[model samples]
Target chain A: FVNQHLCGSHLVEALYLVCGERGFFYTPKT
Target chain B: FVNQHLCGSHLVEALYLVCGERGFFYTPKT
Candidate 1:
């Protein structure tokens, strides 16, 4: 993980956006 | 992309939290 990845919406929304683009996912335990 | 995985903070910050908990990572392409 890193820092300062800003997004003015739900954090995981950003995750999906990037992950979907990258062909992976956050895959959290929640 | 997928759906809600709330953290209420910076997106990559949340990635750290989850990755720390899981002993894994989100090695982003950014």
Candidate 2:
């Protein structure tokens, strides 16, 4: 697992957007 | 604001694809 290499910023952003900052990974839109 | 209409699952999957479940995030190949 290459820290930044494995999980980049953009993906992280998406994770936040999808999963949310708090918790409960909500399902994204279609 | 559209919750589901906002980001979408594609982006979410894309995020996972780009970023691993672990801490580290990686960039996708072009």
Candidate 3:
């Protein structure tokens, strides 16, 4: 959404928000 | 760059990775 991409420098918290609000799954690269 | 946008649902962990690996400006909430 526009809210996230517009994060700019807040990429840190932006990422944090993503984890908190939405979801995140980590699959190690092959 | 390309790594993040491709995050998709992993946007959460992707964002977290940004903060961890890349430089993230400290944004103390708006």
Candidate 4:
């Protein structure tokens, strides 16, 4: 298990830009 | 010619610790 993180932005729109709604990097553990 | 290209090698060594190396490195510009 891991903790989700936020960088670069706090707005959902900004997150979308980096990770998109379904793209980019996401790791559940580290 | 980018004589600026100096292969500017510098010793870059670091122990990889989670949340610890943020301020511990350069680009390691090889």
Which predicted model would earn the best TM-score?
A: 2
Residues B1-30 of candidate 1: C-alpha lDDT, one tens digit per residue = 122233222555655554654423344344
Cα lDDT tens digits for candidate 4, B1-30: 233122211111111123332322223223
Q: What order do candidates take by lDDT, descending? A: 1, 2, 3, 4
| lDDT score of residue B16 within candidate 4 | 19
Question: How much is the lDDT of residue B8 in candidate 4?
Answer: 14
Score residue B24 of candidate 4 by CA lDDT: 28
Q: Candidate 3: where are CA atoms >4 Å away?
A: A1-30, B1-9, B21-30
Local distance difference test, each candidate: 0.42, 0.42, 0.40, 0.26
| TM-scores of the models, in the order given | 0.22, 0.27, 0.21, 0.18
Better of 1 and 2 by TM-score: 2
Per-prediction backbone clash count: 0, 10, 0, 0
Measured against the native two-chain assembly using Cα atoms, what DockQ does each of the candidate structures obtain, in the order listed? 0.14, 0.05, 0.07, 0.02
Candidate 4: regions farther than 4 A off: A1-10, A21-30, B1-30
Candidate 3 residues A1-30, lDDT tens each? 444444432543345456543433322221
Expressed as tens digits, the lDDT of each residue in B1-30 for candidate 3 is 444344433544455456543432322222
Question: Can you write out model 4's per-residue Cα lDDT over A1-30, one digit (the tens) per residue?
Answer: 112223311222332244323323222233
Model 1, which residues run further than 4 Å from truth? A1-9, A21-30, B1-30
* CAPRI-style grade of the A/B interface in model 2: incorrect
